Design a protein around this nucleic acid. Structure first.
Ligand SMILES: *[C@@H]1O[C@H](CO)[C@@H](O[C@@H]2O[C@H](CO)[C@@H](O)[C@H](O)[C@H]2NC(C)=O)[C@H](O)[C@H]1NC(C)=O
Ligand SMILES: *[C@@H]1O[C@H](CO)[C@@H](O[C@@H]2O[C@H](CO)[C@@H](O)[C@H](O)[C@H]2NC(C)=O)[C@H](O)[C@H]1NC(C)=O
Ligand SMILES: *[C@@H]1O[C@H](CO)[C@@H](O[C@@H]2O[C@H](CO)[C@@H](O)[C@H](O)[C@H]2NC(C)=O)[C@H](O)[C@H]1NC(C)=O
Ligand SMILES: *[C@@H]1O[C@H](CO)[C@@H](O[C@@H]2O[C@H](CO)[C@@H](O)[C@H](O)[C@H]2NC(C)=O)[C@H](O)[C@H]1NC(C)=O
Ligand SMILES: CCCCc1nc2c(N)nc3ccccc3c2n1Cc1ccc(CN)cc1
Ligand SMILES: CCCCc1nc2c(N)nc3ccccc3c2n1Cc1ccc(CN)cc1
Ligand SMILES: *[C@@H]1O[C@H](CO)[C@@H](O)[C@H](O)[C@H]1NC(C)=O
Ligand SMILES: *[C@@H]1O[C@H](CO)[C@@H](O)[C@H](O)[C@H]1NC(C)=O
Ligand SMILES: *[C@@H]1O[C@H](CO)[C@@H](O)[C@H](O)[C@H]1NC(C)=O
Ligand SMILES: *[C@@H]1O[C@H](CO)[C@@H](O)[C@H](O)[C@H]1NC(C)=O
Ligand SMILES: *[C@@H]1O[C@H](CO)[C@@H](O)[C@H](O)[C@H]1NC(C)=O
Ligand SMILES: *[C@@H]1O[C@H](CO)[C@@H](O)[C@H](O)[C@H]1NC(C)=O
Ligand SMILES: *[C@@H]1O[C@H](CO)[C@@H](O)[C@H](O)[C@H]1NC(C)=O
Ligand SMILES: *[C@@H]1O[C@H](CO)[C@@H](O)[C@H](O)[C@H]1NC(C)=O
Ligand SMILES: *[C@@H]1O[C@H](CO)[C@@H](O)[C@H](O)[C@H]1NC(C)=O
Ligand SMILES: *[C@@H]1O[C@H](CO)[C@@H](O)[C@H](O)[C@H]1NC(C)=O
Ligand SMILES: *[C@@H]1O[C@H](CO)[C@@H](O)[C@H](O)[C@H]1NC(C)=O
Lengths: 775, 773
RNA sequence: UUU
RNA sequence: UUU
């Protein structure tokens, strides 16, 4: 169905709305630009390869190029692979880009360049040079960039990519870049704000540098600046997980009180880790539009209790004051200045790492009439004592986060302590939705009783993950929580002695009791797995990693439940050959459509398992079980089966006729097994099949009988990579069909390969010429 | 160095003291008895194969055979592999054993036999027929067994191997077995004690059957009986993890009060899971030598508060009353009858699953004057309250076990609830002194008074509690002699470098799986807490997710072993950050360092220079290591064991001798090595152990493997590679066939992958003469 | 393989 | 592959 097989090792896409032909050669172990890139190419990506040089030949025919992504073909030593270090910085020969009349975006990050590449066409709007070795900027090397709007020069001189000197920027080096909008000089060992900058700037990134002082006029002309980041100059180095050098004498970054006077358009101001001890109100007198203010990682503990500057910020949306605690101090309470009430627009308040023993209702009173407050983050504070009922005055909030505290009656794990949380990689460029959420995860709650939740009926999601609850819930513990839709109870020590546990949460839709294995690990203890009958609107139950190998009740019942995750348990033990008592454990989950019973050590399936399955099972995972055998005919019992996941097992054969096993099956995942061949008529008349993963097996040959083309043409996707294909003349049909087929087959260029015979070993099947079989 | 390669796929062993030549063919995927078993063979094992038949041809020349272990060549359907089911029962042809004049032991278990094999020689002392399909015993089928002493017939009729009828034993079927000592009829659907049995019996196993009544005759003549097991007749089925059928009318196994009168030599009596409600003293009036008594899994909760029968048991060493609780009852306290004080000889007391809210010292007073008491096991009792000081009155005990309770201010994982805890297969801090096991309880806070009056303790087990606390050295102050603290599976907060420093005698410290506070960014951790522990020998901090440390070094003058598995040294040693490259350098006496499973995909230079000077044993396993600068091994001048298993290395050093002149054990299994350097092991004379298994090696020439090195090796592992058995392989194949060196799995997995002709063929069996024409 |  |  194709007259010309595609052999280029890059994904090619056409977006003819925007007249884009996109050629993505990311990470193809290329040592040369591949030949035969389409002449109409507009966006070309060659990131993560080992192409040692660029020359006028590189893009000779590619005159329609709009974007070139040529990053990380020689990344600096400490930043790159220690198994394939780059031997020499990329070589860019003269003329290499001058002919690209339409070039608008050029990425040359991560190539060990020593200088700003010259000869760039005047069409260029974006130039990216992060993670090179360019640490002296001269006006003359920037003349060629007259039309530039976006310029990235960071990560060229810092601990992971050292240049061993101060960064150097000539006076007015950027002044004649009259269109420059975005200037990034982060992570560069800069010692002063370079001046004068063009008044067109909207975004300026100077963070993680060696700037000790702002001159009063450094930002004088930037009346268009919208984002200003000066973080990490005079860092707060306590507990930094990167080499960190503070300013002398615990000095803060010094900022004159009038330094921001011209920035009338400023929306974002980041002063993270600048060792600030005061926030003078004078700073914000001519900025009335500020929306986001990051003041995390300073020494503003006392200032939080005063904080006159908040009065000048009626429009502020986000305020971050996290990690301002004074060293070695465990305050008794949280002193929030009354000035907080002046933050009429405030949506998000974050004060992690204030460090205080006891939170009491009045202490939040400055916040009671902030009408737009949606998120209040008091995590990592070592709070020991908290009357949860105080949040009855915060029913309007979307998320109350008390995660990681010591209480006892979404940002990344590494966030406040990252070096550069906005760093770009070489590759590219949750229950909140249910309503009001009270996150008490990773605290020290060992016992709960119903009064702990008095006045919180409004809650829709409660997160108790990772506490120390080691209790036999009987339905009395959660009684105020009349609207709760989601309880995360994972990583506790639930003792399911009573089948009435959780029954008071009459509106519960999702229950996570995963990783509550403790009491399931000791023999002879009663466990009531039929606690589900009482939850009349429960949709989804997660019981992963509970090590369940025994159950006092023999069936689980639900009229509502649609999804059960039962991964990481011991159904091999409950279904021990000879023991029939648990073969209908899920049969009475009458509405169940999704069942994950992966990772249950099921090396075989006892007969009666499939008969025991509830009648509407659609999506069944048996992955990661060490299944050594499988009676495909037993799928006939599963009359609604659409998705069968058998990946990461030990199967050696597929059914003789998959259609004779299941008339409903649409998605068959067989990846990571031991299959060495397909049955003669494997997919004959399997009209419902849409998705088939045979990758990571040991298949040597595939004949046309196994793969009838009326079936192949219905497949959305057919995965065949990482097998042991034998490219002899017996493979002529398969090699021809792979080369000419419309069916989507991932990794044809990278991982659909001959293992032999010798002559063809390691060769891609897509590129195989078998004319010697037709002489 | 040997003139005739061994080709037999069995380990052959000589014990010339006992004139035994031992031939072990266990699990070699054999479908026939291999040819060429040494003719002098005495012990021959063929367990776990698929030999379909035995015939006179089987052991024709092997007339010196004393033992034949021919088990599990046709396991019953539900007991065996469901991926390789046995299609037809083992076929034993006539004569097959009559000529084995010296045969003393015959194991034919797990072969689906329907009848007792006949024609067995008169020399036979031991016959084993477990897990077959023989469920009717007839006196005439037992004549041939006149000299038999040990006879195993169990597991021929039970839930995993059903026979669908009652077991059948004819009257006096065993009476003429005049030397028979051991009789096992367990797990057999037996309905009555077979009678009459020979008085020569020492051991009788009738457990897990359908025996509802003991007749008073039943044990009348067995005055040499030493062990009697009647457990699992009328089982207590509550929470049984197997199909369990109780006797009707909630009846117990009924035993007349004089049933044991003749058992004067009885040392062991097992009545586990017989649904007993009373233990009549009269049972034990003529047995005063009973040592071991198991009464677990009955309904003896109230009887424990009475227990007159104990007065008749002055010689008893072990007493088990575990899991006798009444269903749905949570007693307030433990009512131990004073009769326990009459158990003068008792060393081991076990009372799990009594189930009571609060333990107070008074309840243990009946035990105060049992001078030999060594073990008191009160685990799985859901105790909420216990003043630990009550055990000041028990300093004599070796182990006090409160494991799995709800306290708050080694037997198998499955033991009391196993079907047959003694079934045959086909194929810890106690030593430190007095141990208090509080593992798997609900302790969330500790303070020094919790251990008042317990200074005598040598090992404290707090594993798996809920301790989420910033220890400063004040918490364990009474425990002045403690040598072993297990603190694993808690939530330790290492804020203070003075944690544990009060345990002045601590030699072993496990703080593994205390990851909680290590997973949250920006929290202070003092990994230098070791400086204060002056006699600490072994420190375990596995699986803590450690990726940050406020202190830059760990200091110890005593520590010899550090386990640091399952952490993030990859973060601490991020390229560019030099701060933690001497984290372990000042552990000056450290000999063993486990830093496997630390995501070390590379090692920053300086890691090796940072190692303490006396490092002997280093594990870098399971790190995803893609590269390794072998030359930096020169810094490790005392290195004896290097574990690099389960990584992604593709090469070995050009000269291992130029990398380490001390290295003795190099473990490289499960990597990506596809060839060896030209002179790999040249002059590596001290090397004793080399594991290259599970790699992709195609060829090995003699330059890489000089014979002056290879023959000094205790063991050399090469299995599961990609050997290409062409004429270029002639040296390697010849040497593998003729070497004295131990190479495991030569019979099963030292294989040619090609060329085609020789694909799948073992190199040990390889003929390469066409290379010498 | 810019974190 | 007798648990
Ligand atoms: C192809 O290249 C063009 C230009 O480099 C990309 O267009 C930019 O897309 C971003 C996405 O937010 C816009 O903000 C810019 O304004 C666009 N710039 C120009 C000059 O058009 C386009 O996204 C690229 N497409 C692909 C698929 O790579
Ligand atoms: C940032 O610049 C400083 C100086 O401005 C560099 O510091 C010098 O480094 C050399 C070589 O390491 C030393 O011999 C000098 O003593 C240092 N001078 C000072 C004043 O500290 C520093 O190396 C640069 N940082 C990076 C990452 O390149
Ligand atoms: C070889 O076979 C003999 C007999 O089958 C084994 O000897 C028995 O070992 C037990 C162990 O205590 C003794 O109680 C028996 O009395 C021995 N039988 C005798 C002496 O006839 C011997 O252990 C076997 N050895 C091996 C390695 O299989
Ligand atoms: C133990 O023996 C009993 C008989 O006492 C067997 O039970 C019989 O089983 C068949 C088939 O299942 C039934 O038709 C009979 O009615 C049963 N008889 C009785 C009295 O219940 C039982 O199967 C045997 N157990 C094993 C494991 O073989
Ligand atoms: C050996 C114990 C098997 C039965 C059992 N299972 C549990 C369990 N999972 N949690 C408990 C928690 C507290 C007290 C008793 C039990 C208990 N118990 C004992 C018990 C169960 C039920 C009752 C009646 N409330 C009293 C006592
Ligand atoms: C963002 C906090 C980093 C420093 C830190 N680390 C810890 C820690 N591991 N545990 C604590 C436990 C209680 C109170 C404070 C801390 C604490 N703290 C704060 C703190 C530490 C020590 C002291 C003096 N006891 C007061 C306050
Ligand atoms: C809070 O701190 C401020 C300044 O640090 C102080 O003026 C104020 O009185 C304090 N208030 C309370 C309630 O502690
Ligand atoms: C918590 O505060 C509520 C009022 O919001 C009150 O009803 C309750 O008594 C308080 N509980 C405790 C333990 O102080
Ligand atoms: C609850 O918190 C844990 C840990 O903080 C987090 O992993 C989990 O995703 C949260 N649960 C929900 C439902 O968002
Ligand atoms: C459930 O637990 C609560 C608190 O322990 C108790 O008041 C109640 O009696 C228990 N039993 C029930 C609700 O049946
Ligand atoms: C749960 O099931 C078991 C028997 O299968 C029984 O012990 C218990 O009464 C049942 N309880 C409920 C609420 O279904
Ligand atoms: C099937 O279930 C898995 C989760 O177990 C999910 O990731 C997958 O998308 C599901 N597919 C369909 C078609 O429901
Ligand atoms: C399988 O095929 C046979 C013969 O074609 C047919 O009789 C039988 O009904 C089929 N079974 C199913 C479930 O399609
Ligand atoms: C402490 O108890 C745990 C769990 O009960 C056990 O695994 C561990 O081996 C014990 N510690 C020692 C040192 O024996
Ligand atoms: C250690 O901490 C405990 C915990 O409360 C405290 O009672 C004690 O004063 C502290 N001791 C020292 C020596 O710091
Ligand atoms: C551990 O190191 C810190 C410095 O990081 C120091 O303050 C503390 O005193 C040290 N403690 C010991 C016992 O060495
Ligand atoms: C080396 O250490 C491992 C544990 O990390 C141990 O199991 C092994 O026996 C040690 N070998 C020697 C010779 O000390």
């Amino acid at each position: 169905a194709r007259w010309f097989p595609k052999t280029l090792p890059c994904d090619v896409t056409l977006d003819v709305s925007k007249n884009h032909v996109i050629v993505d050669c990311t990470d193809k172990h290329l040592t040369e630009i591949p030949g035969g890139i389409p002449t109409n190419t507009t966006n070309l990506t060659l990131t993560i390869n080992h192409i040692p040089d660029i020359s006028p030949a590189s893009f000779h025919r590619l005159v329609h190029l709009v974007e070139i992504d040529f990053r990380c073909n020689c990344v600096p030593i400490r930043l790159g692979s220690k198994s394939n270090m780059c031997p020499r910085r990329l070589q860019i020969k003269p003329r290499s880009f001058s002919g690209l009349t339409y070039l608008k975006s050029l990425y040359l990050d991560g190539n060990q360049l020593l200088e700003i590449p010259q000869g760039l066409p005047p069409s260029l709007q974006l130039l990216s040079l992060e993670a090179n070795n360019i640490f002296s900027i001269r006006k003359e090397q920037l003349t060629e960039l007259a039309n530039i709007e976006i310029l990235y020069l960071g990560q060229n001189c810092y601990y992971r990519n050292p240049c061993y000197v101060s960064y150097s920027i000539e006076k007015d080096a950027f002044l004649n870049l009259t269109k420059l909008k975005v200037l990034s000089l982060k992570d560069n060992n800069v010692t002063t704000v370079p001046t004068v900058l063009p008044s067109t700037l909207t975004e300026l990134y100077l963070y993680n540098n060696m700037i000790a002082e702002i001159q009063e006029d450094d930002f004088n002309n930037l009346n268009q600046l919208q984002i200003l980041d000066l973080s990490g100059n005079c860092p707060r180095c306590y507990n930094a997980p990167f080499p960190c050098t503070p300013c002398k004498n615990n000095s803060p970054l010094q900022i004159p009180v009038n330094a921001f006077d011209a920035l009338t358009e400023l929306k974002v101001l980041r002063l993270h880790s600048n060792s600030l001890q005061h926030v003078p109100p004078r700073w914000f007198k001519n900025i009335n539009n500020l929306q986001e203010l990051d003041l995390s990682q300073n020494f503003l503990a006392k200032e939080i209790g005063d904080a006159k500057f908040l009065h000048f910020l009626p429009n502020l949306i986000q305020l971050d004051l996290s990690f301002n605690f004074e060293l070695q101090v465990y305050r008794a309470s949280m002193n929030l200045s009354q000035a907080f009430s002046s933050l009429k627009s405030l949506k998000i308040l974050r004060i992690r790492g204030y460090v205080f023993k006891e939170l009491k209702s009045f202490q939040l009173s400055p916040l009671h009439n902030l009408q737009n407050l949606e998120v209040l983050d008091l995590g990592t504070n070592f709070i020991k004592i908290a009357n949860l009922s105080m949040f009855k005055q915060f029913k309007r909030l979307k998320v109350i986060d008390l995660s990681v505290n010591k209480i006892s009656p979404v940002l990344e794990q590494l966030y406040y302590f990252r070096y550069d949380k906005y760093a770009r990689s070489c590759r590219f460029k949750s229950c909140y939705k249910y309503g009001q959420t009270l996150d008490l995860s990773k605290n020290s709650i060992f016992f709960i009783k119903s009064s702990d939740f008095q006045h919180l009926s409004f809650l829709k999601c409660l997160n108790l993950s990772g506490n120390l609850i080691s209790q036999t819930l009987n339905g009395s513990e959660f009684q105020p929580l009349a609207e709760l839709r989601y309880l995360d109870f994972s990583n506790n020590r639930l003792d399911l002695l009573h089948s009435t546990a959780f029954e008071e949460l009459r509106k519960l839709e999702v229950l996570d009791i995963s990783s509550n294995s403790h009491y399931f690990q000791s023999e002879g203890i009663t466990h009531m797995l039929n606690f589900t009958k009482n939850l009349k609107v429960l949709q989804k139950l997660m019981m992963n990693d509970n090590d369940i190998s025994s159950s006092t009740s023999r069936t689980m019942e639900s009229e509502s439940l649609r999804t059960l995750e039962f991964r990481g348990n011991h159904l091999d033990v409950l279904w021990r050959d000879g023991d029939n008592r648990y073969l209908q454990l899920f049969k009475n989950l009458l509405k169940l459509e999704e069942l994950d019973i992966s990772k249950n050590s099921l090396s075989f399936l006892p007969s009666g398992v499939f008969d025991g399955m509830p009648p509407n099972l659609k999506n069944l995972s048996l992955a990661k079980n060490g299944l050594k055998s499988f009676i495909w005919e037993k799928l006939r019992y599963l009359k609604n089966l659409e998705t069968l996941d058998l990946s990461h097992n030990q199967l050696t054969t597929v059914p003789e006729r998959l259609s004779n096993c299941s008339r409903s099956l649409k998605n068959l995942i067989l990846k990571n097994n031991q299959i060495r061949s397909l049955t003669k008529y494997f997919l004959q008349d399997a009209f419902q099949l849409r998705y088939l993963d045979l990758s990571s097996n040991k298949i040597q040959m595939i004949q046309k009988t196994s793969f009838p083309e009326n079936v192949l043409n219905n497949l959305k996707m057919l995965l065949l990579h990482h097998n042991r294909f034998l490219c002899t003349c017996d493979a002529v049909w398969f090699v021809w069909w792979v080369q000419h087929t419309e069916v989507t087959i991932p990794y044809l260029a990278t991982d659909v390969t001959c293992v032999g015979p010798g002559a063809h070993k390691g060769q891609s099947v897509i590129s195989l010429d078998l004319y010697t079989c037709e002489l």
